[PDB]
Design an enzyme around this catalytic site. Structure first.
Site, PDB file in Angstrom:
ATOM      1  N   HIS A 206       0.835  -1.188   0.000  1.00 16.61           N
ATOM      2  CA  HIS A 206       0.000   0.000   0.000  1.00 16.61           C
ATOM      3  C   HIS A 206       0.870   1.238   0.000  1.00 16.61           C
ATOM      4  O   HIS A 206       1.976   1.235   0.547  1.00 16.61           O
ATOM      5  CB  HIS A 206      -0.915   0.034   1.206  1.00 16.61           C
ATOM      6  N   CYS A 237      -7.678   2.623   2.666  1.00 18.00           N
ATOM      7  CA  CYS A 237      -7.339   1.929   3.900  1.00 18.00           C
ATOM      8  C   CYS A 237      -8.318   2.350   4.996  1.00 18.00           C
ATOM      9  O   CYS A 237      -8.410   3.531   5.345  1.00 18.00           O
ATOM     10  CB  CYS A 237      -5.908   2.268   4.328  1.00 18.00           C
TER      11      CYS A 237
HETATM   12 CA   LIG Z   1      -4.691  -4.109  -0.865  1.00 14.99          CA
END
Ligand SMILES: [Ca+2]
Length: 283
Positions: A206, A237
């Protein structure tokens, strides 16, 4: 030139990490564009409880409405045996299972221990291998867990070694909360590389902390030649709302090419796909 492959995540991992339901027709249109981008693998959807992830409750219609470029493998995430059956019915080309390297995250996401998630997954992976389907495994919290904090390289290498031993042909090491840096990532890979070849490893970093592209460089230096990304950064997220989620597929390929790596993907198509997803990302 050296080849680097990317597995597109926007359709499943991306849409899953979005607080809204994208119309089935839109999901299908989105997948059809990605299919013309040049990917070898695309994770079309997930056959997981519609109550735990309503975003993909139309997984069945999607697999049916999508067009099969025939030169592209469409995989689906499978949580259990019931899911495998649906995946086999949906004519999935490949399968993907998931587990966590963190005990706290496991009994919070899958609602069971790591060892228990591996045991239950033993039969589904077996069924898949029997049907000749390729199975990849996902490992979350390879660097840090929003629950247990840092996760040792050994913990990640342990679960990674057990996934391969069960049958998985590839394992995706995912930095779930995007807290990984070139150092932590490097220490994790070293442990994993000690019990598995770089050839069967995929990086899933990420960009939440703005280091995704940096963690990818380290992985390349270590030998990894596969990485997971979302065309337009789809899927953020939950622990960092609004913050950047998956690493943008475009950003990754533009960097990879600059490094002399060949991805076999069409940037133009990719940018066009990203713009498409953005028409659902913001609203
Ligand atoms: Ca992911």
């Amino acid at each position: 030139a050296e080849h680097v492959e990317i597995v597109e995540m926007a359709a499943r991992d991306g849409l899953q990490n979005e607080k809204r339901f994208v119309p089935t027709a839109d999901k299908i249109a989105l997948i059809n564009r990605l299919s013309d981008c040049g990917y070898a693998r695309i994770e079309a959807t997930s056959f997981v409880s519609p109550k735990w992830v309503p975003q993909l409750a139309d997984s069945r219609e999607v697999m049916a409405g999508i067009r099969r470029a025939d030169g592209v493998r469409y995989s689906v995430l499978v949580p259990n045996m019931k899911g495998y059956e649906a995946a086999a019915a949906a004519h999935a080309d490949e399968i993907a299972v998931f587990i966590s390297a963190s005990e706290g995250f496991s009994k919070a996401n899958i609602n069971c221990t790591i060892a228990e998630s591996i045991e239950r997954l033993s039969p589904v992976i077996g069924a898949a291998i029997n049907d000749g389907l390729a199975i990849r495994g996902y490992v979350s919290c390879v660097v840090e867990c929003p629950y247990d904090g840092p996760v040792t390289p050994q913990a990640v290498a342990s679960v990674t070694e057990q996934l391969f031993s069960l049958g998985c042909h590839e394992v995706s090491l995912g930095d779930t909360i995007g807290r990984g840096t070139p150092d932590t990532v490097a220490a994790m890979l070293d442990a994993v590389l000690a019990i598995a070849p770089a050839h069967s490893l995929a990086g899933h970093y990420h960009d939440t902390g703005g280091r995704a592209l940096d963690n990818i460089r380290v992985s390349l230096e270590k030998g990894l030649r596969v990485f997971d990304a979302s065309v337009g950064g789809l899927g953020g997220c939950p622990f960092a709302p609004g913050a950047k989620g998956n690493v943008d597929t475009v950003a990754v390929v533009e960097m990879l090419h600059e490094m002399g790596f060949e991805t076999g993907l069409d940037l133009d198509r990719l940018r066009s796909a990203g713009l498409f997803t953005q028409a659902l990302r913001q609203d």
